[PDB]
Amino acid sequence: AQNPNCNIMIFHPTKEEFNDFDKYIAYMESQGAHRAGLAKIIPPKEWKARETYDNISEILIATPLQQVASGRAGVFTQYHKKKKAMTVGEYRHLANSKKYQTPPHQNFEDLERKYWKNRIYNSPIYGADISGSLFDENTKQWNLGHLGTIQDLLEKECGVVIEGVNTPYLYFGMWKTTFAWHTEDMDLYSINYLHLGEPKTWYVVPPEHGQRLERLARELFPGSSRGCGAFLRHKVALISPTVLKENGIPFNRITQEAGEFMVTFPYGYHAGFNHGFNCAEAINFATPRWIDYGKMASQCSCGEARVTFSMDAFVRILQPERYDLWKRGQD
Numbered sequence: 001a002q003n004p005n006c007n008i009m010i011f012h013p014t015k016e017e018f019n020d021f022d023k024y025i026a027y028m029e030s031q032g033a034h035r036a037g038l039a040k041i042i043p044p045k046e047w048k049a050r051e052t053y054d055n056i057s058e059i060l061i062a063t064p065l066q067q068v069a070s071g072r073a074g075v076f077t078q079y080h081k082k083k084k085a086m087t088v089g090e091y092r093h094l095a096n097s098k099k100y101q102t103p104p105h106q107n108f109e110d111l112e113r114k115y116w117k118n119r120i121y122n123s124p125i126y127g128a129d130i131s132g133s134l135f136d137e138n139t140k141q142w143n144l145g146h147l148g149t150i151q152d153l154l155e156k157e158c159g160v161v162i163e164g165v166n167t168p169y170l171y172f173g174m175w176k177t178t179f180a181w182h183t184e185d186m187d188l189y190s191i192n193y194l195h196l197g198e199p200k201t202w203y204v205v206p207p208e209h210g211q212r213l214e215r216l217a218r219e220l221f222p223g224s225s226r227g228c229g230a231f232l233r234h235k236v237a238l239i240s241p242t243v244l245k246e247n248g249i250p251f252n253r254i255t256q257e258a259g260e261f262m263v264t265f266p267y268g269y270h271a272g273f274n275h276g277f278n279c280a281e282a283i284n285f286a287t288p289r290w291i292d293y294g295k296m297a298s299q300c301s302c303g304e305a306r307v308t309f310s311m312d313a314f315v316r317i318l319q320p321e322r323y324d325l326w327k328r329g330q331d
């Protein structure tokens with residue numbers, strides 16, 4: 001078995017190997033990359049996402065989210081408070097202000113310490129989940145707006161044509177902006193490209209150990225757990241690396257820098273934070289190996305998780321027994 005310790009693997013495809021996305025994902029899996037739950041892909045030196053980032057300031061963040069924490073430094077939840085619209089230019093200025101800017105630090109490790117120590121005492125503002133793309137239409141390789149769709153994959157594997165579309169999202173981040181512990185909708189893959197700015201630190205639990213994370217989370221968030229059998233779908237809970245180590249949960253960590261791709265694999269729980277002003281683009285995708293995960297994915301039916309139009313058909317076709325209860329949650 002390849003990669004039996006479930007370490008995060010880092011790939012350096014050549015320009016030739018960067019042509020066929022599906023084939024390269026399948027290559028990574030042949031080397032065991034999926035066992036970690038997350039891989040890093042460094043694009044060939046010849047490649048670029050677009051020519052420059054000099055003209056992005058007029059993009060609108062219609063609903064910036066202020067991430068307010070409750071709990072203790074290592075075990076907390078966050079809720080999102082809606083703020084007034086602002087442009088990317090306005091947001092970048094706010095990120096760089098004395099109130100929100102990254103503190104002085106020595107290295108990534110020092111910054112990570114400062115994050116876990118101090119995150120709860122501040123409420124950073126995240127521009128998340130903005131439909132759109134920063135890839136140039138002429139970028140042919142690993143263009144996240146031109147991937148094969150999940151609907152077409154389900155059709156190719158299972159023969160059923162379904163409604164729905166699959167498009168990318170932009171994330172504008174600042175110091176301490178946080179992504180809570182989650183897997184993707186329907187335990188899909190994700191791919192994330194850091195277009196510009198400061199790094200993003202990730203933590204991940206191997207898919208084969210995801211249930212260990214879930215059991216810890218039920219112990220650490222006992223009211224949430226009683227409210228919903230899949231409350232990590234709410235994307236509100238944070239657990240620090242110190243706390244995971246104390247409880248014997250297997251995980252790994254890696255820092256993503258500008259120009260790098262991360263791929264999350266089905267049922268790979270992940271969480272993390274942004275180091276400073278940045279912009280990432282991400283999208284879900286599927287492969288033939290996903291289908292079995294989609295069939296087994298947990299669902300939130302308490303009504304909190306409320307998700308895209310396109311998840312309907314996935315539940316309907318892959319989880320017909322669950323469909324009725326799940327749709328009651330959506331309505």
Ligand SMILES: O=C(O)CNC(=O)C(=O)O
Binds near residue numbers: 171178179190280282
């Ligand atoms: O970048 C972020 O805030 C969160 N991204 C993801 O969880 C992802 O790409 O799967």
Ligand SMILES: [Mg+2]
Binds near residue numbers: 055056057059
């Ligand atoms: Mg603009």
Ligand code: NI
Binds near residue numbers: 184190
């Ligand atoms: Ni994710």
Ligand SMILES: [Zn+2]
Binds near residue numbers: 227229233234301305
């Ligand atoms: Zn729920």
